[PDB]
Amino acid sequence: HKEIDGRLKELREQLKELTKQYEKSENDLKALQSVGQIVGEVLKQLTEEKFIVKATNGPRYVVGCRRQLDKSKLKPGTRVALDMTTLTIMRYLPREVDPLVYNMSHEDPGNVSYSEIGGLSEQIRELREVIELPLTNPELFQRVGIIPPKGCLLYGPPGTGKTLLARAVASQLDCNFLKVVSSSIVDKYIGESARLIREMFNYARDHQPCIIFMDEIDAIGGRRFSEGTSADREIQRTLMELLNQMDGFDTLHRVKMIMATNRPDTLDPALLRPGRLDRKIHIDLPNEQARLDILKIHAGPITKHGEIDYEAIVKLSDGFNGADLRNVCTEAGMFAIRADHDFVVQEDFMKAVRKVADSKK
Amino acid sequence: EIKIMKSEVLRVTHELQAMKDKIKENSEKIKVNKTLPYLVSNVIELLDVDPNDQEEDGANIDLDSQRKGKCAVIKTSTRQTYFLPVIGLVDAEKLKPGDLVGVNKDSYLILETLPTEYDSRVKAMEVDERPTEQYSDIGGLDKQIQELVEAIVLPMNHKEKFENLGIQPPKGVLMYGPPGTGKTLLARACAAQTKATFLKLAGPQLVQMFIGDGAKLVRDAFALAKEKAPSIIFIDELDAIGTKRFDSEKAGDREVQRTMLELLNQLDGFQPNTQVKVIAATNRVDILDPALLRSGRLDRKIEFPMPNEEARARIM
Amino acid sequence: CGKTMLAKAVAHHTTAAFIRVVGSEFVQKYLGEGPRMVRDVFRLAKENAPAIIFIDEIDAIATKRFDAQT
Asked: Of A239, A272, A274, C68, which is least packed with CB atoms within 10 Å of its CB?
């Protein structure tokens, strides 16, 4: 009597974990019996029993639909679930494009600071005034009655580092960055560049507001000259899409565009007009006071002695951007590790700056 | 009171056996579909709400492409897309938007998860797990060695020093000078010494007939590198990966440019890794194709020193 | 420059459908599975007249060897 109770609890707990797992495997079997689901879109509704579907078990078909399904689900032009031999409409669901996370790679708006390679500050302020203000009020623009921006272009030498200037910006605006890497848009398949861009653009309008950041367009850059269609047909395919969105009845309603270009010369004649690329901003080479600031923000986290004449280094230095000064700072820091001190001197900076200058174009 | 106890111990033993029989049955079932021919497929979209999507069309005349895919998709390699509802036979969170899955061509369900990465694992990626070179056995190369040792090897180890300073390491190195000096020999000696994997990439190899293929190849190279950590990616060329033209008409040569740009952005896109070390070399003496302004780009400069008579003697 | 807007403008007033046709998304690299959806599309438009057929940027399909680097 006594013994039985004691044994009973041990075997019951053991058996329960085993019975439960096993029971799941049985559910899985039930599923292998279950029928496959073919994807279709309805072209049109013929009769209450006949539908046009263009399926992918075979070709175009006229198909049936279950008499268990609602009339309210019949809606004009929708995505449908089809069977794989009965060829009937299992379900209806409302047509949106599929969302893209395989084409939307996420870079968070605050993995950096705009006081890191700040001192590029001034260009940040001009990009902010264009972009940032529409997001806060359309109302202010509206009273006057004036069309606001859609797109902005940054071009020039990537002395900031092309991507860095932009990335710093993304952080400040704190919005929904839909990121584009240009050479994943180009593919070796038919009509994928066209399909991809379009869906991507579609997703932005539902989801609005959103910024589409295009980094280094040069897969869009190329007006041809030998008038090929070698690879060159794809160049034409993509370019045409960019213009088609603008030429449309679409309005980038709260949709923002930022473009990056290394050298500008392959722009279209329709971009000069606003209503695609409104604003095109240049790089600007820092003033010595900016330069001091940039050197100062770099020097500040890292270890040092107790006395550095900042201005002297400012003098030697010219023709650099914030990324370009940063390297000199770190360069000085290597020489200190060599010297085995956490203590720097004026000399390391003088030499560092000259070392970088020579190496340069 | 006595009775109920003793029957419950017999009940529990009987229940285990019926459930035990069920699992047995499932095991054979799954196994049969594995024996090849078998369909591997690629999951494009993870998602598990909003079914239905579309593939294929009718005909007549006038040509514009279209393709779609949603809920969860697998695209099998006859180029067919399939809608499945998830199973616990493998977990969907463990799966990704871009994963290879093993599918049971019956109900079209994911029996299993396969490893990481798709398509080519580079069409000619040479791995040298331990090079046969040592630099302690060749003297008179000495000047170049002193600079090389100091450049690569020192950040990994000496990390503790770096951390206290607060400066970060490099990531790329440039070597320039007359080819065929046995510049490469020293690169192979450092790799042997350090305990990184040496990955040899040749620049015309990235170039393909196929359109956009190279960028995938480089991205993959980078990804394989991440897994291997540490690694040396040795890039031969800065001529077939060091041109991009500044010519106005340059469009035809777009392929070459796209790949080069891809490397530079792949470097600029994020903030460094201490899993990769990259060494770049020229193969024709000196070009200008900017790729050296940041240190997430290249920043270290190694020069070949002109021949010293003393050095030649030592080699002899 | 509004070259496009005038076209739409006459269409809106006149009482006939706007059909917007992409002529450089006619272009394709090889036959396969992809371009056959628009096949059915044009023919219905002819049937249920009136309509305005506007073809945007025909040229992708129109460049052929007349330069002889195509």
From this structure: C68
Interface test with A, best of B43, B265, B295 (most A CBs within 10 A): B265
Q: How many CB atoms lie within 10 A of CB A285?
A: 14
Determine which of B55, B56, B61, B65 to mutate to test the interface with C (most C C-beta atoms within 10 Å).
Answer: B65
Closest partner residue to A225 (CB to CB) among B211, B249, B295 is: B249
A149/chain B closest Cα distance in angstroms: 27
Query: In chain B, what is the straight-line distance between the N-terminal and C-terminal CA atoms, in Å?
Result: 100
- Tokens 């707990």 locate to A13
User: In chain C, what is the straight-line distance between the N-terminal and C-terminal CA atoms, in Å?
Assistant: 29
The two three-digit tokens of residue A199, written as one number: 């869906």
The CA radius of gyration of chain C, in Å to the nearest whole number, is 15
Q: How far is A227 from chain C (nearest CA, A)?
A: 6
Q: Does A30 touch chain B (CB under 8 A)?
A: no
What whole-number distance in Å separates Cα of residue B238 and Cα of residue A35? Answer: 55
DSSP H or E segment with residue C52: strand C51-56
Deposited resolution, Å? 6.8
Edge-to-edge, what's the strand order for the sheet holding A151-155? A177-181, A210-215, A255-261, A151-155, A277-281
The tokens 């010595």 sit on which residue? A288
Question: What values do phi and psi take at A235, rounded to 5?
Answer: -65, -40
Helix (H) or strand (E) holding A350: helix A346-359
The beta-strand segments (E) located in chain B are: 39-43, 73-76, 80-83, 99-104, 109-113, 126-128, 172-176, 197-202, 231-236, 277-281, 300-303
CA–CA distance, A50 with A208 (Å, rounded to integer): 38
